[PDB]
Design a binder for this molecule. Sequence first.
Ligand SMILES: NC(=O)C1=CN([C@@H]2O[C@H](COP(=O)(O)OP(=O)(O)OC[C@H]3O[C@@H](n4cnc5c(N)ncnc54)[C@H](OP(=O)(O)O)[C@@H]3O)[C@@H](O)[C@H]2O)C=CC1
Ligand SMILES: NC(=O)C1=CN([C@@H]2O[C@H](COP(=O)(O)OP(=O)(O)OC[C@H]3O[C@@H](n4cnc5c(N)ncnc54)[C@H](OP(=O)(O)O)[C@@H]3O)[C@@H](O)[C@H]2O)C=CC1
Ligand SMILES: N[C@@H](CCO)C(=O)O
Ligand SMILES: N[C@@H](CCO)C(=O)O
Ligand code: NA
Ligand code: NA
Lengths: 319, 319
Amino acid sequence: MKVNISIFGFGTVGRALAEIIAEKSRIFGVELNVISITDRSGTIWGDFDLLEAKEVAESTGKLSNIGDYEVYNFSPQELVEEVKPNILVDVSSWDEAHEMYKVALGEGISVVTSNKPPIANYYDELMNLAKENNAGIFFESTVMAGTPIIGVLRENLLGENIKRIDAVVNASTTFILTKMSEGKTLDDAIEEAKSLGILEEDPSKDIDGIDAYYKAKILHWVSYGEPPEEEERLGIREVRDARNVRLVAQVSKGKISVKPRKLSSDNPLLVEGVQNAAVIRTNNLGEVILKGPGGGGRVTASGVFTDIIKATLKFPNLR
Amino acid sequence: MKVNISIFGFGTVGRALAEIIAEKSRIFGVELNVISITDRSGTIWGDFDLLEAKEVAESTGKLSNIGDYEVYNFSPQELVEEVKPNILVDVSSWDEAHEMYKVALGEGISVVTSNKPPIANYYDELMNLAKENNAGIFFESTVMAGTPIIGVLRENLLGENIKRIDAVVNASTTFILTKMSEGKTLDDAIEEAKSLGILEEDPSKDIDGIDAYYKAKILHWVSYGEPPEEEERLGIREVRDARNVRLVAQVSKGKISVKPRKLSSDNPLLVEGVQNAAVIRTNNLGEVILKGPGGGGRVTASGVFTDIIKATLKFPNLR
Ligand SMILES: NC(=O)C1=CN([C@@H]2O[C@H](COP(=O)(O)OP(=O)(O)OC[C@H]3O[C@@H](n4cnc5c(N)ncnc54)[C@H](OP(=O)(O)O)[C@@H]3O)[C@@H](O)[C@H]2O)C=CC1
Ligand SMILES: NC(=O)C1=CN([C@@H]2O[C@H](COP(=O)(O)OP(=O)(O)OC[C@H]3O[C@@H](n4cnc5c(N)ncnc54)[C@H](OP(=O)(O)O)[C@@H]3O)[C@@H](O)[C@H]2O)C=CC1
Ligand SMILES: N[C@@H](CCO)C(=O)O
Ligand SMILES: N[C@@H](CCO)C(=O)O
Ligand code: NA
Ligand code: NA
């Protein structure tokens, strides 16, 4: 069977995804065909070579330069309405992308994304809409990227009661905390990280706990099927003694709390360097621990590719 | 969506499964209906209360002792043919149950199991049969029990090439090796383990690496879709220095090797207690680490329940 895929967004994650798809376009009795790609500059739509498009975007930073394919100025809504892919893959930084998803799901087009806010903020509407149009929504790389914590929660532990999830999901903050442990001030450590590309020049999504908050919210959705009643979002700006501290996202029924935690040397949450980690507590299993990378092009595109296959094959969305 | 389930075997695992099915009989749009339970004493079949049957077997030791249901003495083939369930659940210690699986699958009856040898030895025949009869096969609790290593490998990482897997999958051997580490002889360590509940009167399959080898073989099937060419099995009996040693299953394309390995102090495979672990190495993610309990009744039944749901909902088997 053949499936048509519109990729929406084409930055680090989207370009890595094109590689993965190109290397594995025929797999699991499926053929993956990318019929469109979109960035801010525009949309290409037709018979283009996927790695060729990646190359030209890699050098030039836009889809315009492609030889002999020509650009279309579609709105998100037009792109879906006109291209009519079977699968819409959002790998963009467009926070307000839920409106585009609504349209796609209306036409029974499944959505795959790595873009958090639409899932964190509109999870319920999007799920209902999906079920109503014999379609699916997939978001694995919205949490710990390619490391399959969403698979584990969504499609497994199906007889468990999840009492708690704790997770360290920002490598940058483990870096900052480690430097502080070694005697640097927070502000120095931040300066080091920004100059290293570990942090952005606006570091708030890491330092103020916002990325983790969105990830806690998504986890809360999957595990409990409703928005939380209680929210506590904090970052690391108040940390003084940073020994054995990590920025931890904790999820329990009706509660999300992102904040710094001092951890025993024993704790698998006490991750080193760039490693992310999640400890899931259940009634029958005690702790299940999952660790892996939390970012990177190929790492993130890995999750999305898993989701493309599931969408194509219409895997049930149970949670 | 109502589903009819035959449970084959009723020991620690099957009795704990009963508990779980009773508390969660309606979930995810499914009504789970248990129509037959079978042990060596024979087979009950009908309108019987699930927890009651658990209760009589609990105390008495057999199934025959129930009220208002004649026990039938059915062979495995007769059980499938006469009961006609939608899903056959094997939680027995019968090494040769694959022949029964072949029957069910032939009738489009899906199979869920925690029983290792049939999957280790007949996985391809079983997958081909299931495919030809619009049926599935699920075996999560054959490796690390409820700890969902199978879900992770089988239904996720779908864009990955699995470079390797290292795993410690026998809590019993951890205990033994730890005790040898502290000065105890093999035999004294074994006797302590028995007294603790940690080993059976025949520990041989765990001690000699046959269990792990079965497990390694299952992981190899999931990851590469064929048997290995190189096979090495070595148990713990003859370890002279057990310091920081575990019984590690190593899996790579074409290759399985179970043997005691000395590990660094920070190695995640350096597990304690009941805990099992798998370190999965893939081309895009590097290391994914999954840990959790490896045995126990409710732990093992958790994985089987997950599989029951997926069989009922016709989850794809991509690997
Ligand atoms: N990098 C990582 O490790 C991870 C990233 N993610 C998430 O995946 C998404 C992509 O990440 P990443 O690839 O690093 O980000 P990049 O900034 O590298 O790429 C973002 C892409 O989206 C495009 N875009 C942004 N807004 C719009 C819009 N309104 N319409 C059309 N296109 C738009 C960008 O266009 P332009 O360049 O033209 O502005 C660019 O092509 C993000 O939401 C991120 O949070 C998730 C997990 C890991
Ligand atoms: N417990 C654990 O931690 C784990 C177990 N498993 C596996 O799950 C399975 C169940 O283990 P568990 O419940 O602990 O073991 P038990 O020995 O407690 O139960 C085994 C069951 O199988 C029955 N049985 C064996 N052979 C036959 C047969 N030919 N016909 C009918 N019934 C039969 C037994 O009957 P009788 O008592 O009458 O002999 C018993 O009810 C095993 O294959 C085991 O390897 C896998 C992972 C973890
Ligand atoms: N490595 C990222 C996670 C990407 O979703 C961060 O914590 O900011
Ligand atoms: N962890 C268990 C494995 C049972 O499948 C043991 O020690 O045998
Ligand atoms: Na993920
Ligand atoms: Na398992």
